Design a protein around this ligand. Structure first.
Ligand SMILES: O=S(=O)(NCCNCCOCc1ccc(Cl)cc1)c1cccc2cnccc12
Lengths: 20, 336
């Protein structure tokens, strides 16, 4: 499932802002 | 609305052109607990001794700000925040600086971040999602009228207050710009295709980001995710989103018009502006004035257990706040 794929991903925690 | 906004603008412009500066000092606050950390600073819960009010004090290390080329962005943050005034915006109460650091003392939300509750609970129902989204729609209408682009909508940046209403925080990328701007900034999952493809962009990227948020709130995951940012940018730029089977017809159609790569067709960006969003069928239950008034009952209210309880926040390791006996970067931050 898509939920399963998300929860298994490395990006379920707080996501950092990015900048150049 | 037009009238409200006109007067809103008069209020903003006066503070914009004559910003508050140096309205407190570090020794006026007792430092309690770290509520969040970033590359060039942290935020701590603090107590204002004179009032016994609790605040979230953002502390930025000037040298690290300078290292990361975030000087102008940081000046934008303080200058914009001191000037704005809106129910769903966290208030900047005081700002000051010392030899080492910059400080912004803002209104504390013990309810924690949306992110925390969304991840734990899994997903929000459409009405629940719709209630938050309404407050974002109104907040951007407000900010955009002042020529401000926000540039970091995400659940991590939305606080839940004691009435279960939201406060938008984190104005580090907010900018007053009348034309196009070009900085690559934001959060990967939330970036409009314009940004990724290094075009000049405008306030339409906030409307795209709104689309990402609504989706994430209602699905429980984002429309575009992968293990690495590059894989995310590919997905975003492909122009393809799959919606959960549980998404209503109206929701999907609102999201198609928000997550629209084509700017002439992206909602919020059209001839009819924010009303394209506001008069959409998904929002037909929304009383916009009652939302602004905070009269709608919140679908979820944070568990309260003290004005300075921190149980809705994660634990971070503490570190000394050290102030050098020498002034660092005085010139870079002269106007702060
Ligand atoms: O920063 S907060 O602790 N929480 C918002 C979190 N934003 C998401 C990512 O930020 C990580 C981060 C934290 C601090 C700095 Cl200086 C850089 C990056 C915060 C800010 C403003 C007002 C608040 C009111 N109450 C609680 C927390 C508040």
């Amino acid at each position: 499932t898509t939920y399963a794929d998300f929860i298994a991903s490395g990006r379920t925690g707080r996501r950092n802002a990015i900048h150049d | 609305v037009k009238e409200f906004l006109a007067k809103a603008k008069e209020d903003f412009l006066k503070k914009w052109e004559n910003p508050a500066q140096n309205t407190a000092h570090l020794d006026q606050f007792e430092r309690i607990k770290t509520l969040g950390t970033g590359s060039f600073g942290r935020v701590m819960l603090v107590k204002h001794m004179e009032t016994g009010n609790h605040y979230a004090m953002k502390i930025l290390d000037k040298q690290k700000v300078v290292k990361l080329k975030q000087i102008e962005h940081t000046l934008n943050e303080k200058r914009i925040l001191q000037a704005v005034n809106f129910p769903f915006l966290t208030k900047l109460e005081f700002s000051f600086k010392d030899n080492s650091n910059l400080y912004m003392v803002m209104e504390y939300a013990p309810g924690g971040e949306m992110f925390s509750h969304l991840r734990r609970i899994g997903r929000f129902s459409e009405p629940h999602a719709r209630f938050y989204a309404a407050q974002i729609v109104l907040t951007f209408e407000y900010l955009h009228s002042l020529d401000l682009i926000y540039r970091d909508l995400k659940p991590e940046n939305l606080m839940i207050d004691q009435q279960g209403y939201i406060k938008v925080t984190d104005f580090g990328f907010a900018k007053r710009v009348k034309g196009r701007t070009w900085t690559l900034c934001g959060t990967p999952e939330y970036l409009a295709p314009e940004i990724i493809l290094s075009k000049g962009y405008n306030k339409a990227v906030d409307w795209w980001a709104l689309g990402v948020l609504i989706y994430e709130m209602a699905a429980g995951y984002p429309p575009f995710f992968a293990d690495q940012p590059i894989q995310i940018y590919e997905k975003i730029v492909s122009g393809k989103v799959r919606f959960p089977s549980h998404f209503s017809s109206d929701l999907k159609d609102l999201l198609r018009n928000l997550l629209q790569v084509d700017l002439t067709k992206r909602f919020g960006n059209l001839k009819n502006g924010v009303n394209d969003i506001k008069n959409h069928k998904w929002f037909a239950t929304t009383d916009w004035i009652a939302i602004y008034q905070r009269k709608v009952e919140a679908p979820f209210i944070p568990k309260f257990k003290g004005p300075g309880d921190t149980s809705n926040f994660d634990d971070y390791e503490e570190e000394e706040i050290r102030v050098s006996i020498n002034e660092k970067c005085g010139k870079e931050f002269s106007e702060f």
